Design a protein around this ligand. Structure first.
Ligand SMILES: [Ca+2]
Ligand SMILES: [Ca+2]
Ligand SMILES: [Ca+2]
Ligand SMILES: [Ca+2]
Ligand SMILES: [Ca+2]
Ligand SMILES: [Ca+2]
Ligand SMILES: [Cl-]
Ligand SMILES: [Cl-]
Lengths: 236, 4, 236, 4
């Protein structure tokens, strides 16, 4: 790897600089280099890794949606044939997106998840595994779409089982996992009722635990609760 | 839908 | 070049798709491929080339400014020594930015400018040459800073001489050239009075020519005139 | 300063 010669601490420092500069591709490459040093990641370092790849894949997903919409309109009746270019370029963006997801999934499998023993790290990584399989599922159409969806579901489910046993209902990692699993149910798994039920139960159990929190923790938890409510408002 |  | 196997028309089509998808690096690579086909560019194609590289270099310039500001703060008295990482990463972004400018300047020199005979194409390309030398000047510090500044000035000056002879004072290319040359004077050449005089004279001569324009041309010209006014308000 |  091109980051193999850089110190772990220097890679982390540069990832933080890249974030300030909105250079998320650089940020992800620095954090990949840091993971490949082989040491476990701290809470702050896990968040840097997630922010970097979330921004990279977010740009790819947005571009893929634009191109997919153009491609489907070209297949409507009355549409003028324009040749292979729209499909080719959508496929180009799609392949790049799949490559980023495969990179993240590879870091999780070699070897972040297997060394993560604490609930906070293990749930974080399993949620990430669910998220990246979910992004693969958004573009999947072939022999493996079903297996990709089940891989996302399985990772989210293992993360949920640990979170329910080991974390309070207001824990922001637990809340963000439930939020994203609910989005998986609604957008990927054709299960809007499961999505609504999960979001409602997560919100209500968090509500009942807010009294235990400091002012700062209260702000962290209620911010994510608002996203659950925003989805429930959209879905009902 | 809004994810995290 | 990696675009050597793609049709000129397909490259242009994909550049337009990349713009819709906000994939400006892809857009620039497609337009570079189109230029390298060796044919002259139409007005619309020139604008695609400019939009693509303006967005690529704009992201690099914004990142460079963030990192440069952090680097200078680290050199203030009382600042804790953090090692070479800030300088290294600023240099990395700077080298990438310089590479993009060199790429654009190379396309102009081989061979866009020499084949551009009409005022609209020749002024457009010479303005671009001034702009990319200006972006190089923003980061220059060494033996050549003076020569980079003079290269920008010379390109802008040749573009101005043609524009004054061949285009009306409301022509949007002429107006955008004068705007950018005025920014060169203020930001690069330490000549705020020249910047103010150029902006004022350009605005006033355009004002007096608006009566000749259609409603659509009036909108095009007045939009750029407003940028001249915004700068004059900032500078005086 | 604002450029084009
Ligand atoms: Ca070391
Ligand atoms: Ca461990
Ligand atoms: Ca616990
Ligand atoms: Ca051909
Ligand atoms: Ca010619
Ligand atoms: Ca003329
Ligand atoms: Cl393509
Ligand atoms: Cl670096």
């Amino acid at each position: 790897g091109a980051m193999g010669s850089m110190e772990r601490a220097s890679l982390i420092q540069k990832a933080k600089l890249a974030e300030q500069a909105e250079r998320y591709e650089d940020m992800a490459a620095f954090m990949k280099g840091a993971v490949e040093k082989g040491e476990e990641l701290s809470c702050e370092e896990r968040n840097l890794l997630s922010v970097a790849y979330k921004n990279v894949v977010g740009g790819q997903r947005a571009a893929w949606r634009v191109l997919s919409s153009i491609e489907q309109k070209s297949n409507e009746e009355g549409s003028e044939e324009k040749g292979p270019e729209v499909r080719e370029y959508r496929e180009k963006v799609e392949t790049e997106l799949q490559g980023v997801c495969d990179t993240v999934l590879g870091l999780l499998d070699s070897h972040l998840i297997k060394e993560a023993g604490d609930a906070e790290s293990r749930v974080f990584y399993l949620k990430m595994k669910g998220d990246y399989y979910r992004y693969l599922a958004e573009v999947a159409t072939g022999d493996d779409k079903k297996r990709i969806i089940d891989s996302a579901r399985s990772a989210y489910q293992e993360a949920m089982d640990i979170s329910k046993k080991e974390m309070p209902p207001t824990n922001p990692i637990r809340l963000g996992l439930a939020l994203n699993f609910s989005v998986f149910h609604y957008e990927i798994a054709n299960s809007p009722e499961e999505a609504i039920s999960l979001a409602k139960t997560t919100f209500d159990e968090a509500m009942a635990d807010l009294h235990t929190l400091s002012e700062d923790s209260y702000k962290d938890s209620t911010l994510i609760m608002q996203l659950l409510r925003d989805n429930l408002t959209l879905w009902t | 839908s809004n994810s995290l």
